[PDB]
């Protein structure tokens, strides 16, 4: 339905994180069989990829930032659910050094 | 520090670690008016600009080539610092140089030049 | 009704806590209110007998990257019966959510969606709030002063994979910014 | 002909003869279709070159 | 209100501050501060054509007219001194119609050559005409004209478009110090010129380009190259000399178009030297773009970075732990010199010094090689004792301060050294250290003049450090300083003048030559931008590796060559003669396949088999904090800590040879100017 | 005795001290009266003095291979600073 108002405390933020992750999982088979990909990728590893993406922003403290990040998460998920994203965009998107940089360019 | 707004901005992550310079541009020497002072800008160092090998046009691959000049102007140093801090850029503030007004009088043109003492 | 009559009556009739800032000029009567009283103020202006604002013209948005409340959403309104034009504007933020007005004016849905698309200002309890103008998978909000004019990504056709793909931008000729601003102004 | 660039083609036009200290150059005979008027003080013995057209003016007297 | 342009008002007398009403808003200004300056304090910007804040006040062009309640006629705000309780009026019909009336007269005889004027986009005449002017235009008769007379290879003049504001004349008479430009004639038709064939032959003679408001005087090398709006303005510093003058590099794409001085009240004060201004041409001349390898037959063949670095790392192992001498350059930021020093030290050798007069300079207490008195502080000196320095060709922007002090405060100068031409009256005491011995004795009236003069300054040039009796001469000048009491807790008089940009930072990092026998029996020579060190001293079998951006002489005798980056496309820090540390901005991209100096040195270090703690520009700066921490504090005016009493005694006799100049051609000092086309033709007719 | 045998033990002895010197005052008092006497009997030894107002009082030393053995003297005394220089010299040999 409509956009949730806000989260006053971090407990509601964690609850919304869990709800978003659960919804993304319940939507994992439809995106498996709508893009016509069954054997190329198993549904298991997408769960780990989503978990890693969620855990990436672990240092966020502001509840509003958490809410807006979760909203962007639902937006991306809904875009993927519809046959709107380009073919195999998801699989490509969701998968000393000093000398190495020096031999290529000055800007590293 | 505090790059949460940088995280939610949606811009490519590799551009969040750019080093930027914050300064107030000084008055040009070729003009005497001071109607272009007191405004602070963030200076992304868009150094890499090669030359197109068909017509000599200046090509570029840096998305921030002219952002800090054409747009994104701040009315104060604090606003620019807060902006760069919010977007998680490694800023480096450069304080501007201000002219020092000195007592200048027209009569100083015409001095007694002392007394013709032997020397 | 006369522009000054709207000024006087609305300022006297309105609750005092709703309007933080208000302006009268020939350009247009302006009511700068808080972010949370916006819904109530719009509801009052829609239903009151003397001030019957029935149609919402558009929902604008201005980015000021020099103040704490960076964005500023502007609601242009029109009173068809009394032939007046009132303008209500509030201040927003990158993360602050502002109450929607789709319940009052159903036409505001697309304008709120495009404001979210361009400036990234979310709207509370807005049904089906998603990007409307920019393409699918777009990253960043173009109308912010931060967004480069040319953008971050390009579009081309790649032969190894028979589809249209995207790369980081590589301009053949950079946008030449001409600084015409001069002193004595 | 096109082998003569304007660099070496404007130099083959003989300098104009005029009396007085200064002369007004407008380019075309119609002032609106020429360049902005350019008064040049032709006092040196070298011909004075108009900066817009490149036409050279020299003083017949003296 | 706040002052326009952020101008700072210095109240030398808190009690004396007359209060005036600029437009009804009362402000307080000290004694003096002519009506124009009072309005400047109160945030009101007044039109001006003849008034320059750096020159003497002149009253012509009548453009800054304002209305004072107790004045019948409109007064020239740029000349009328402030009085207590004035009611000034700026936005008044009198003070306005005055401005349109004056500017109509200004524009009635101006030529119509705006599309071809090189100052089209930044002309004060048209910018003020749009704001403070009437659009109609009434003049219809024939205008006047003035013929153009050549002067200088680098000052293109079109005197037709010259409002007679006499600003150039006052500049040449006061700041430049050479009187060659003057105003000739009477009435309508007065010209400005030298009246003869002479050209402006002055070191800071290119500043007439900026100071002239209209496009009458414009730079000849930049003739019609570009417009101001299509120029990206970058604020960097200069490396041509050791003054470190602030500049403003203007670039259109990947090349530098022009260099414009930047205001800095403590270093250069809105002026720059010609060598600084016109060295931008060299950055696009013959430059090293790819690494090269010396062949068996002497041919140069470009290779990849991996190949050349592999060759250098293979050859460096074969040599002894000693004989790995590495010489820095005069154009090398502090980070690169630190990386070079660390790299050489980790190889077991300590033969590292700075290009140009670094044989045995102590670099020990930070005042024996520094300009202890601030450059802005030279204006309070009452006597100068220039010792073998000739600061007209080594430091062009210090002679400006010296001449400004001489003409304003009427000081005395006692130049000692080889014969030279000065912009000011100087008393040539002598040519050698015998004159110093006389000064320490008093066999001349100048000893009495120095003893009776408070706040004296003794400037010692860097050339004296090359002499074998560096310690004896330094002890002699120190005894002169102590006996005459020029150094005080409230005023430090003794100071030294360096000549290279990368010299103060080189001495701060502690890289100093220890033995005069180096570069003689040492095989591995790492010439890091040292383009002028005598290559005849290096032995034939040395495998000299050259790291630089311009190759003029060391390139011929060099083995494997690593291209470098100039100062306009790097970031590292440079230090001033007075200990001021300031950074550089990467205005333009690097040409060819070249990297930063410190990056190349660190890559060589890693290839050679030794590991350094740092791998980024931030890591090098942290390392510098442990060797010369003052090089990482940019905006700090830290004074000298200790006095000169800590120096041990030097009992050796001084010398018998008079002082010798160090720079012969002012226009060819570094490889940037030595490879420039404009500088070469400037150093052909402007030599004398 | 030990003062003379420093040049053959290390090279490039660095001393850092603040200008205001809330805690660098002992270091300044050490260096002012124990520099001329040291360098007079220790020729051809670079003993660098770098101030950089707003920095801690370190004391560094570079040996033959470039190894670096900083000694922090923030809260020491002049005899204790001298003994720190002692143990710094002996570690080099
Ligand atoms: C095909 C897939 C479609 C959708 C793709 C979407 C991919 C991106 C997903 C959204 C990315 C986001 O950042 S949206 C969600 C962002 N939310 C957060 O990052 C919460 C911050 N972390 C915490 O609260 C805790 O540390 C926590 C780690 C939760 C637990 O650890 P503990 O309990 O010990 O405390
Ligand atoms: S000096 Fe100014 S007004 Fe005169 S022609 Fe040039 S741009 Fe136009
Ligand atoms: S040449 Fe330039 S500075 Fe000199 S009087 Fe003319 S306009 Fe003024
Ligand atoms: S600017 Fe003051 S009279 Fe010319
Ligand atoms: Zn013509």
Number of other residues whose CB lies within 10 A of the CB of residue E335: 27
Report yes or no: E388 and E431 within 8 Å, Cβ to Cβ.
no
**What are E195's two structure tokens?**
């009246």
CB E381 within 8 A of CB E410: no
Task: Say whether B58 and C181 touch across the interface (CB within 8 A).
Answer: no
Largest CA distance in chain F: 35
Question: A17 CB less than 6 Å from ligand 1?
Answer: yes
Element (H, E) at A10: helix A10-26
Residues of E annotated as binding site? 50, 61, 64, 78, 110, 114, 117, 123, 162, 165, 168, 212
Give me ligand 5 centre to Cα E687, in Å.
Answer: 38
With a 6 A CB cut-off, is E127 part of the ligand 2 pocket?
Answer: no
How open is the CA angle E163-E164-E170, to the nearest 5 degrees?
A: 125
Measured N-to-C along each axis, helices E334-345 and E617-624 cross at an angle, to the nearest 10 degrees, of 80
**Annotated resolution, angstroms:** 3.7
- Domain count within chain A: 1
Question: Which tokens sit at D49?
Answer: 């070159």
d(CA C52, CA C80) in angstroms, rounded, equals 8
State whether residue A72 sits within 8 Å of chain C by CB.
no
Q: Which residues of E touch D48 (CB under 8 A)?
A: 147
Residue E371 tokens read as 């300009």
User: In this structure, which residues have their CB less than 5 angstroms from ion ligand 5?
Assistant: D 25, 27, 50, 52-53
Cβ-Cβ contacts under 8 Å between A and C: the total is: 48
CA–CA distances in Å: residue E6 to residues B27, E3, E64:
11, 5, 21
- Enumerate residues 6+ apart whose C-beta is below 8 A from E100: E132, E133, E134
Please tell me if residue E520 touches chain F, with a CB cutoff of 8 Å: no
Cβ burial of B17 (10 Å; 0-12, 13-18, 19+) is exposed
Contact E146, E111 (CB under 8 A): no
For the record, the structure tokens of C71 come out as 């964005």
Q: Does E613 touch chain F (CB under 8 A)?
A: no
Token representation of residue E20: 């005036």
Range of the domain at A30: 1-108
* C57 within 8 A of C42, measured Cβ to Cβ: no
The label of the residue with tokens 């509601």 reads A12
F79 HSE (CA, 13 A, CB side):
0
Residues of C in contact with A4 (CB under 8 A): 124
The phi, psi pair for B12, rounded to 5°, reads -45, 135
Q: Which of C65, C182, C185 sits opposite B72 (nearest CB)?
A: C65
B94 forms beta bridges with B23
The continuous run of DSSP H or E covering F62 comes out as strand F59-62
Query: Is E177 in contact with E403 (CB distance < 8 Å)?
Result: yes
E613 CB-contact burial (10 Å; exposed 0-12 / middle 13-18 / buried 19+): exposed
Whether B98 and chain E come into contact, CB under 8 Å, resolves to: yes
What's the gap in Å between the CA of A43 and the closest CA on chain C?
22
The tokens for B61 are 């691959």
Domains of chain D: 6-59 (2.60.260.40)
Q: Check pocket membership of E159 for ligand 2, CB cut-off 6 A.
A: no
Calculate how close chain A gets to B22, using CA atoms only, in Å: 21
Residues 6+ apart with CB under 8 A from F57: F16, F17, F18, F23, F24, F27, F72, F73, F74
Q: In whole angstroms, how far apart are CA B81 and each of B92, C39, E34, E139, E637?
A: 9, 34, 38, 53, 24
E344 and E326 Cβ atoms separated by less than 8 Å: yes
Q: Do E238 and E501 contact (CB within 8 A), yes or no?
A: yes
| Alpha-helical segments (H) within E499-590 | 501-508, 554-557
Residue E47 near ligand 4, beta carbon < 6 Å: no
Distances (CA, A) of E618 to A96, C6, E408: 18, 62, 45
Does residue A66 have its Cβ closer than 6 Å to ligand 1?
A: yes
Q: Do D48 and E146 touch (CB under 8 A)?
A: no
Classify residue B73 by burial, with Cβ atoms within 10 Å: 0-12, 13-18, 19+.
middle
Q: Give E587-651 as a DSSP string.
A: -SPPPSS---HHHHHHHHHHHHT---S--SHHHHHHHHTTT-GGGG--S--PPP-S-GGGSPP--
DSSP reduced 3-state for A77: helix
Q: Could you tell me which chain C residue has the CA closest to the CA of E131? A: C184
Report the gap between the CA of E87 and the closest CA in chain F (Å).
Answer: 48
C-chain CB neighbours of B72 within 8 Å are: 65, 145-146
Q: How many CA atoms lie within 13 A of E155 on its CB side?
A: 28
Query: Could you tell me how far CA F30 lies from the centroid of its own chain?
Result: 9
CB E576 within 8 A of CB E633: no
CB of E214 sitting under 6 A from ligand 2: yes
> Residue E82 carries which DSSP code?
P
Query: Cβ of E144 under 8 Å from any chain D Cβ?
Result: yes
Check if the beta carbon of residue E345 is closer than 8 Å to that of residue F66.
Answer: yes
B11:C174 CB<8 A: no
Phi and psi (nearest 5°) for B63? -60, -25
Domain positions in chain F are 1-93
Of E112, E142, E145, the CB nearest to D36: E112
The beta-carbon neighbor of D24 closest among E115, E142, E147 is E142
Q: Which of E390, E476, E468, E465 is nearest to E433 (CA)?
A: E476
Helices (H) and strands (E) in chain B, counts: 3, 5
SS3 content of chain E, % helix, strand, coil (to 5): 30, 15, 60
CA of E106 to the centre of ligand 3 (A): 13
Which ligand has the minimum distance to the alpha carbon of residue B32? 4
What would you measure as the largest C-alpha separation in chain A, in angstroms?
A: 54
Please give the DSSP secondary-structure letter assigned to residue E28: E
Q: Give the strands of the sheet with F11-16, arranged side by side.
A: F47-50, F11-16, F59-62
Is residue B37 within 8 Å of residue E5, measured between CB atoms?
A: yes
CA distances E237 to A60, E234, E445, E621, Å, are 41, 10, 42, 19
Whole-number Å distance between alpha carbons of E112 and E128: 16
Whether C96 and chain A come into contact, CB under 8 Å, resolves to: yes
Given a contact as 3+ CB pairs under 8 Å, which chains touch D?
E
Mind telling me how many Å the CA of A64 is from chain C's nearest CA? 6
Tell whether ligand 4 has an atom less than 6 A from the beta carbon of residue E678: no
Q: Is D33 exposed, middle or buried (0-12, 13-18, 19+ CB in 10 A)?
A: exposed
CA F21 vs. chain centroid, Å, equals 16
Residue C115: φ, ψ to 5°: -65, -45
Method by which the model was determined: cryo-EM
* C-beta atoms of B4 and A61 within 8 A: yes
CB atoms within 10 A of CB C81: 12
Q: Do F68 and E626 touch (CB under 8 A)?
A: yes
CA distance E156 to E278: 14
Cα(E498)–Cα(E508) distance, integer angstroms? 13
User: Which strands form E75-76's sheet, in the order they lie side by side?
Assistant: E75-76, E65-68, E88-89
> Which string of DSSP letters, residue by residue, matches chain C?
--HHHHHHHHHHHS-TTTEEEEE--SS-EEEEE-SSSHHHHHHHHHH-SSS---EEEEE--EE-TTSSS-EEEEEEEEBTTTTB-EEEEEE--SS--EE--TTT-TTHHHHHHHHHHHH---EET-TT----SS-TT--S-TTSTTS-TT-SEEEEEETTTTEEEEEE--BSS---------S--
* Other CB atoms within 10 A of residue E606 CB: 19
Contact: B63, C152; criterion CB under 8 Å: yes
Spatial contact of E157 and E151, defined as CB atoms under 8 Å apart: yes
Q: How far apart are CA E545 and CA E539, in angstroms?
A: 13
Residue E230, classed as helix, strand or coil, is helix
Both tokens of D11, joined, read 């130099």
Calculate Rg over the CA atoms of chain E.
28
Q: Are strands D56-59 and D16-18 parallel, antiparallel or unpaired?
A: parallel
CA of E275 to the centre of ligand 2 (A): 28
DSSP state of B19: B
């Amino acid at each position: 339905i409509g956009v949730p108002p806000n989260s006053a405390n971090l407990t509601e933020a964690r609850r919304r994180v869990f709800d978003f992750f659960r919804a993304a999982c319940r939507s994992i088979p439809t995106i498996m069989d709508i893009y016509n990909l069954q054997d190329v990728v198993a549904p298991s590893q997408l769960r780990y990829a989503i978990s890693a993406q969620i855990r990436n922003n672990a240092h966020i403290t502001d509840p509003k930032v958490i809410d807006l990040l979760i909203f962007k998460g639902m937006e991306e998920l809904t875009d993927i659910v519809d046959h709107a994203k380009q073919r195999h965009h998801i699989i490509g998107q969701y998968v000393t050094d000093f000398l190495k940089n020096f031999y290529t360019s000055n800007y590293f | 520090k505090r790059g949460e707004i940088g995280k939610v901005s949606g811009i490519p992550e590799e551009h969040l670690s750019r080093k930027v310079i914050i300064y107030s541009p000084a008055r040009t020497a070729t003009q005497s008016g001071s109607g272009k002072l007191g405004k602070w800008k963030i200076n992304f160092v868009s150094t890499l600009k090669w030359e197109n090998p068909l017509m000599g046009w200046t090509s570029t691959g840096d998305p921030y080539a002219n952002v800090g000049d054409s747009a994104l102007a701040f009315d104060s140093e604090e606003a620019a610092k807060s902006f760069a801090e919010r977007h998680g850029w490694d800023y480096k503030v450069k304080k501007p140089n201000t002219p020092l007004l000195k007592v200048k009088s027209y009569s100083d043109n015409f001095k007694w030049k002392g007394n013709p003492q032997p020397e | 009704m006369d522009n000054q009559f709207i000024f006087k009556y609305s300022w006297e009739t309105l609750p005092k806590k709703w309007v933080k800032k208000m302006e009268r000029s020939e350009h247009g009567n302006r009511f700068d209110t808080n972010t949370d009283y916006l819904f109530q103020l719009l509801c009052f202006l829609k239903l009151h007998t003397y001030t019957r604002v029935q149609v919402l013209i558009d929902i604008c948005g201005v980015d000021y990257p020099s103040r704490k409340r960076r964005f500023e959403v502007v609601y242009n309104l029109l009173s068809t019966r009394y032939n007046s034009r009132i303008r209500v504007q509030t201040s927003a933020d990158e993360v602050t959510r502002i109450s929607s007005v789709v319940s009052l004016f159903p036409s505001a849905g697309w304008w709120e969606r495009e404001v979210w698309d361009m400036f990234g200002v979310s709207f509370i309890n807005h049904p089906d709030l998603r990007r409307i103008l920019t393409d699918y998978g777009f990253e960043g909000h173009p109308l912010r002063k931060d967004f480069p004019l040319s953008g971050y990504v390009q579009v081309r056709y790649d032969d190894p994979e028979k589809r249209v793909v995207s790369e980081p931008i590589e301009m053949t000729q950079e946008f030449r910014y001409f600084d015409f601003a001069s002193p004595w102004e | 002909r096109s082998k003569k660039s304007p660099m070496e083609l404007i130099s083959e036009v003989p300098p104009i003869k005029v009396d007085g200290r200064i002369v007004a150059c407008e380019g075309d005979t119609n002032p609106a279709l020429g360049h902005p008027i350019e008064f040049i003080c032709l006092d040196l013995n070298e011909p004075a070159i108009c900066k817009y057209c490149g036409l050279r003016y020299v003083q017949d007297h003296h | 209100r706040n002052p326009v342009g952020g101008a700072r008002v210095h109240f030398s007398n808190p009690e004396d501050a007359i209060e005036v009403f600029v437009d009804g808003y009362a402000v307080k200004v000290p004694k003096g501060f002519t009506v124009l300056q009072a309005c400047e304090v109160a945030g009101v910007d007044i039109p001006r054509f003849c008034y320059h804040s750096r020159l003497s006040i002149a009253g012509n062009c009548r453009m800054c007219l304002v209305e004072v309640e107790k004045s019948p006629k409109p007064v020239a705000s740029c000349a009328m001194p402030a009085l207590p309780g004035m009611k000034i009026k700026t936005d008044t019909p009198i003070a306005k119609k005055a401005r349109e009336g004056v500017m109509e007269f200004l524009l009635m005889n101006h030529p119509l050559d705006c599309p071809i004027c090189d100052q089209g986009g930044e002309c004060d005449l048209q910018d003020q005409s749009m704001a403070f002017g009437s659009d109609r235009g009434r003049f219809t008769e024939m205008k006047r004209s003035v013929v153009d007379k050549n002067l200088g290879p680098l000052v293109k003049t079109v005197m037709t478009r010259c409002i007679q504001c006499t600003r150039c004349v006052r500049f040449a008479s006061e700041v430049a110090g050479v009187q060659d430009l003057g105003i000739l004639g009477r009435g309508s038709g007065e010209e400005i010129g030298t009246y003869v064939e002479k050209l402006m032959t002055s070191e800071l003679s290119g500043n007439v380009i900026d100071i002239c408001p209209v496009g009458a005087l414009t730079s000849k090398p930049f003739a019609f190259k570009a417009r101001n709006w299509e120029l990206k303005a970058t604020e960097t510093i200069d490396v041509s000399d050791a003054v470190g003058s602030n500049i403003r590099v203007d670039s259109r794409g990947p090349e530098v178009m022009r260099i414009i001085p930047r205001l800095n009240e403590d270093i250069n004060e809105e002026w720059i030297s010609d060598k600084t201004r016109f060295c931008y041409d060299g950055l696009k001349r013959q430059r090293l773009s790819d690494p090269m390898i010396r062949d068996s037959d002497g041919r140069f063949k470009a290779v990849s970075w991996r190949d050349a670095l592999a060759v250098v790392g293979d050859i460096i192992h074969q040599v002894k732990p000693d004989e790995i001498v590495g010489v820095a350059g005069q154009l090398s930021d502090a980070e690169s010199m630190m990386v070079l020093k660390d790299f050489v030290n980790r190889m077991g050798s300590d033969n590292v010094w700075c290009e140009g007069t670094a044989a045995g300079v102590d670099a020990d207490l930070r005042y024996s090689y520094l300009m202890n008195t601030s450059i802005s502080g030279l204006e309070n000196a009452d006597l100068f004792l220039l010792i073998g320095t000739q600061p007209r060709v080594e430091a062009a922007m210090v002679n400006a301060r010296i001449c400004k002090t001489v003409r304003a405060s009427n000081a005395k100068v006692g130049y000692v050294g080889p014969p030279a031409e000065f912009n000011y009256d100087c008393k040539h005491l002598g040519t050698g250290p015998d004159t110093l011995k006389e000064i320490a004795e008093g066999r001349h009236p100048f000893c009495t003049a120095l003893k009776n003069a408070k706040n004296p300054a003794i400037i010692v040039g860097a050339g004296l450090f090359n002499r074998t009796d560096k310690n004896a001469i330094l002890s002699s000048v120190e005894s002169i300083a102590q006996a005459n009491n020029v150094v005080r807790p409230d005023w430090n008089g003794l100071n030294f003048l360096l000549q290279y940009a990368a010299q103060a930072a080189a001495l701060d990092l502690g890289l100093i030559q220890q033995s005069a026998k180096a570069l003689e029996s040492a095989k591995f020579v790492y010439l890091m931008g040292a383009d002028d060190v005598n290559v005849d001293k290096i032995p034939k079998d040395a495998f000299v590796v050259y790291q630089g951006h311009h190759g003029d002489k060391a390139v011929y005798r060099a083995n494997v060559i690593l291209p470098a980056s100039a100062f306009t496309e790097k970031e590292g820090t440079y230090e001033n003669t007075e200990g001021f540390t300031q950074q550089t901005v990467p205005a333009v991209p690097t040409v060819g396949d070249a990297r930063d100096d410190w990056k190349i040195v660190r890559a060589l270090s890693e290839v050679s088999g030794v590991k350094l703690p740092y791998n980024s520009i931030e890591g090098v700066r942290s390392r510098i904090k442990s060797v010369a921490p003052n090089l990482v504090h940019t905006d700090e005016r830290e004074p000298a800590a200790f006095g000169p009493s800590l120096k041990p005694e030097c009992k050796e006799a001084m010398s018998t040879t008079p002082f010798q100049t160090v720079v012969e051609n002012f226009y060819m000092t570094n490889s940037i100017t030595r490879a420039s086309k404009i500088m070469a033709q400037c150093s052909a007719v402007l030599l004398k | 005795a030990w003062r003379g045998s420093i040049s053959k033990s290390m090279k490039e002895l660095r001393i850092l001290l603040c200008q205001s010197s809330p805690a660098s005052a002992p270091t300044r008092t050490f260096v002012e009266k124990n520099y001329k006497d040291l360098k007079s009997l220790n020729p051809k030894l670079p003993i660098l003095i770098r101030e950089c107002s707003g920095v801690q009082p370190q004391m560094w030393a570079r040996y033959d291979m470039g190894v670096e053995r900083c000694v922090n003297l923030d809260g020491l005394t002049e005899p204790q600073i001298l003994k720190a220089l002692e143990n710094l010299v002996k570690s080099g040999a």
